[PDB]
Amino acid sequence: NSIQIGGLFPRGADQEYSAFRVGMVQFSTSEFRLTPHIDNLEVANSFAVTNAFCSQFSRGVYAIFGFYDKKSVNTITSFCGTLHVSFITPSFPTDGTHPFVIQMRPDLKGALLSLIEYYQWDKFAYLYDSDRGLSTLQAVLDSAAEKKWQVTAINVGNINNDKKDETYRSLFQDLELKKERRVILDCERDKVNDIVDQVITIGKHVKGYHYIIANLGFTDGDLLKIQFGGAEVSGFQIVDYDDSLVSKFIERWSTLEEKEYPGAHTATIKYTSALTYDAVQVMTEAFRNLRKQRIEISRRGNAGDCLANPAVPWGQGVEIERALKQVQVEGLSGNIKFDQNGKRINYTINIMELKTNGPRKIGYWSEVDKMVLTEDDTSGLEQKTVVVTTILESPYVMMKKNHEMLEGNERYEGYCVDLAAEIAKHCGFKYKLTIVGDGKYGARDADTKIWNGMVGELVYGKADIAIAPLTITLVREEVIDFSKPFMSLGI
Amino acid sequence: NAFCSQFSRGVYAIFGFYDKKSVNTITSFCGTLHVSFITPSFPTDGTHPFVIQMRPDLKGALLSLIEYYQWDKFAYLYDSDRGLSTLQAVLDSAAEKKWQVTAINVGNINNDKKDETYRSLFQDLELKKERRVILDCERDKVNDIVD
Amino acid sequence: QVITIGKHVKGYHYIIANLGFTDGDLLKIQFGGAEVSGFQIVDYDDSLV
Numbered sequence: 292n293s294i295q296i297g298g299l300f301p302r303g304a305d306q307e308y309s310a311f312r313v314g315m316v317q318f319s320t321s322e323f324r325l326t327p328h329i330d331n332l333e334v335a336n337s338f339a340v341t342n343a344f345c346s347q348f349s350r351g352v353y354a355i356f357g358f359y360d361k362k363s364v365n366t367i368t369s370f371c372g373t374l375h376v377s378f379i380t381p382s383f384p385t386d387g388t389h390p391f392v393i394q395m396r397p398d399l400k401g402a403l404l405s406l407i408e409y410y411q412w413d414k415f416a417y418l419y420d421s422d423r424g425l426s427t428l429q430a431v432l433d434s435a436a437e438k439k440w441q442v443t444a445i446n447v448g449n450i451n452n453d454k455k456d457e458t459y460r461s462l463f464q465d466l467e468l469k470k471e472r473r474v475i476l477d478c479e480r481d482k483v484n485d486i487v488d489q490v491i492t493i494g495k496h497v498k499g500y501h502y503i504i505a506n507l508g509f510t511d512g513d514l515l516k517i518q519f520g521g522a523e524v525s526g527f528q529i530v531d532y533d534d535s536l537v538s539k540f541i542e543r544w545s546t547l548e549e550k551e552y553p554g555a556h557t558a559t560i561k562y563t564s565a566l567t568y569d570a571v572q573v574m575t576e577a578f579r580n581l582r583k584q585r586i587e588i589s590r591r592g593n594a595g596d597c598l599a600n601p602a603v604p605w606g607q608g609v610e611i612e613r614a615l616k617q618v619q620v621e622g623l624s625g626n627i628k629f630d631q632n633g634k635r636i637n638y639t640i641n642i643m644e645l646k647t648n649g650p651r652k653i654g655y656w657s658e659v660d661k662m663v664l665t666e667d668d669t670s671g672l673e674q675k676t677v678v679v680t681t682i683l684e685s686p687y688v689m690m691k692k693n694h695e696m697l698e699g700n701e702r703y704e705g706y707c708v709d710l711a712a713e714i715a716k717h718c719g720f721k722y723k724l725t726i727v728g729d730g731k732y733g734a735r736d737a738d739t740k741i742w743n744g745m746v747g748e749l750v751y752g753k754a755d756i757a758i759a760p761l762t763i764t765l766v767r768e769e770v771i772d773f774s775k776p777f778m779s780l781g782i
Numbered sequence: 783n784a785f786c787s788q789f790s791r792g793v794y795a796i797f798g799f800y801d802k803k804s805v806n807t808i809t810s811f812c813g814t815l816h817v818s819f820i821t822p823s824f825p826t827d828g829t830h831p832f833v834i835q836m837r838p839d840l841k842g843a844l845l846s847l848i849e850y851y852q853w854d855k856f857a858y859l860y861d862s863d864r865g866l867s868t869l870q871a872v873l874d875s876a877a878e879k880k881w882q883v884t885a886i887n888v889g890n891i892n893n894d895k896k897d898e899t900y901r902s903l904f905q906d907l908e909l910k911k912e913r914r915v916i917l918d919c920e921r922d923k924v925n926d927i928v929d
Numbered sequence: 930q931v932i933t934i935g936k937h938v939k940g941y942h943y944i945i946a947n948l949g950f951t952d953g954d955l956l957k958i959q960f961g962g963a964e965v966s967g968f969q970i971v972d973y974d975d976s977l978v
């Protein structure tokens with residue numbers, strides 16, 4: 292059953308169309324086949340989109356797969372909600388709940404709010420691009436008003452190429468006025484690779500700055516530039532290379548010839564092409580389940596004018612979309628589930644931070660569960676709170692009256708407490724205030740030389756340092772060492 | 783449908799209104815078919831051919847009014863249906879003149895909840911105790927909000 | 930390698946000990962913040978030059 296479908300592709304989406312051609316024969320043909328009529332046409336001109344849509348409707352296909360632009364989403368929704376034709380896309384998700392649209396891209400906005408609340412920022416700048424839409428820009432301002440954030444948002448998208456070396460300099464020098472430190476970028480990969488190069492030219496990737504990329508292919512762009520910088524860069528992945536089917540597709544994809552499939556003979560892949568690959572799995576599962584329920588999709592006639600007055604559609608497409616919303620398979624993004632509208636739920640997004648060796652993950656974020664870090668504590672050097680032994684003596688070391696409500700190093704008070712604070716301030720170490728067990732100053736045992744008290748805590752490797760009323764003798768220099776004396780006294 | 787019908791009728795001059803959703807469709811037809819279109823609707827953003835528009839721009843006057851009243855911190859309630867060009871405009875001057883701007887959408891709220899949602903909105907403004915409000919909507923929303 | 934590891938901010942200072950000071954690349958660290966000085970024996974302002 293070679294079923295007629297329609298395909299919309301931009302002039303330049305070569306990796307995505309190549310991935311579609313791969314997924315065409317990656318798994319098919321025990322059954323129905325597909326008849327893809329491909330339209331390598333533009334996406335900006337909605338008149339061209341209209342011409343292509345009426346041409347594929349004159350073909351009279353059952354499903355249309357492709358992309359759209361923000362100058363075209365109204366056109367696609369307005370025609371599909373009329374003519375009841377199911378439309379499937381990997382582009383940015385729509386704003387209103389629209390019928391007959393299945394959209395392959397998960398949300399980013401809740402993840403990004405989770406990330407900001409994890410890093411605990413208060414004031415930052417937000418470079419956005421207009422041509423991807425403004426849904427995230429609308430979303431962040433609400434939580435900025437509620438969570439008392441200070442947002443300086445700046446449009447950057449409409450700047451021409453021919454002044455695109457000094458516009459950015461003027462922009463970041465204006466950011467120098469408030470002395471900005473925290474930047475969230477929201478662009479396409481080309482604008483990312485332009486702006487990173489201009490930042491690395493003007494020298495703003497030292498230790499001190501911090502960057503968040505708001506995309507899905509965090510490692511799909513260039514990161515060898517600012518890998519060794521000093522700044523810290525975090526982002527998001529939906530394609531995780533550690534998994535079995537993922538690495539299988541990596542090996543299969545790397546072994547292909549670049550001349551047959553352009554942009555395919557690499558190691559990594561674009562997330563757009565990954566969702567394009569998973570779309571074929573969903574679209575084949577659909578007709579699989581319709582032959583499982585044995586419901587015929589016989590058009591039984593021709594299609595006609597898309598300007599039919601009034602046009603009347605056919606509700607077996609409603610049943611097609613109904614079975615589309617029930618598909619649940621595993622793919623490159625992981626599990627998939629749909630809502631009552633065609634939006635994706637049941638996804639998982641990895642949080643990816645750049646380090647010196649390269650990118651790595653620190654945690655995940657679910658559709659309902661918040662940011663769950665994976666406890667990747669590779670911190671091999673922790674400055675240990677050193678062992679400080681003492682004994683209770685007024686006014687050297689005294690208890691406070693509210694010691695149960697307070698905690699630890701706050702509980703003790705006196706001359707020695709103040710002094711140990713001064714020593715730790717000058718020497719930069721961490722410390723924890725402890726008490727000797729046996730409550731003595733300490734002397735040696737007869738015939739066994741067992742130094743008890745605070746002496747054996749330092750002799751026997753138990754305690755680390757002792758700021759305490761201890762007297763320099765002759766018999767104590769042989770086992771421990773003293774500094775210069777700080778307070779004189781006598782019997 | 784209506785535009786294809788009247789061009790089939792052979793119209794010499796097209797006139798009509800447009801909302802924020804049909805504007806790309808109308809300019810995309812008019813750039814191709816070279817038909818002079820006239821409108822009182824909201825002005826566009828890019829320089830598009832064959833579109834004459836009677837409603838003048840507003841953004842320079844509104845920025846001049848802000849500079850005359852000599853403000854630094856204010857709230858800004860907007861509706862999405864007329865466009866977001868003014869919202870994109872005032873944020874740049876906020877970035878230059880270092881303004882403290884809180885901007886909140888209002889256009890999504892349905893009619894069955896427009897007694898308590900607005901109250902919650904003004905209570906959340908009174909968390910900061912705002913004194914200076916720019917409303918940016920249509921006349922219907924203005925009459926609904928001033929009450 | 931300096932411009933990769935990020936050591937051309939305001940604060941650093943460089944002296945090139947050659948004769949073709951502008952014969953090498955200087956568009957890289959022109960906008961840096963550091964200051965670079967060197968030597969020329971070929972002066973482009975002159976008539977025969």
Ligand SMILES: NS(=O)(=O)c1cc2c(cc1Cl)N[C@H]([C@H]1C[C@H]3C=C[C@@H]1C3)NS2(=O)=O
Pocket residue numbers: 775776777778779780
């Ligand atoms: N007046 S006191 O007992 O509190 C006191 C006693 C002493 C102080 C400082 C004070 Cl405030 N520092 C001296 C040191 C300073 C120098 C000279 C000897 C030591 C090095 N040791 S000390 O003679 O033990």
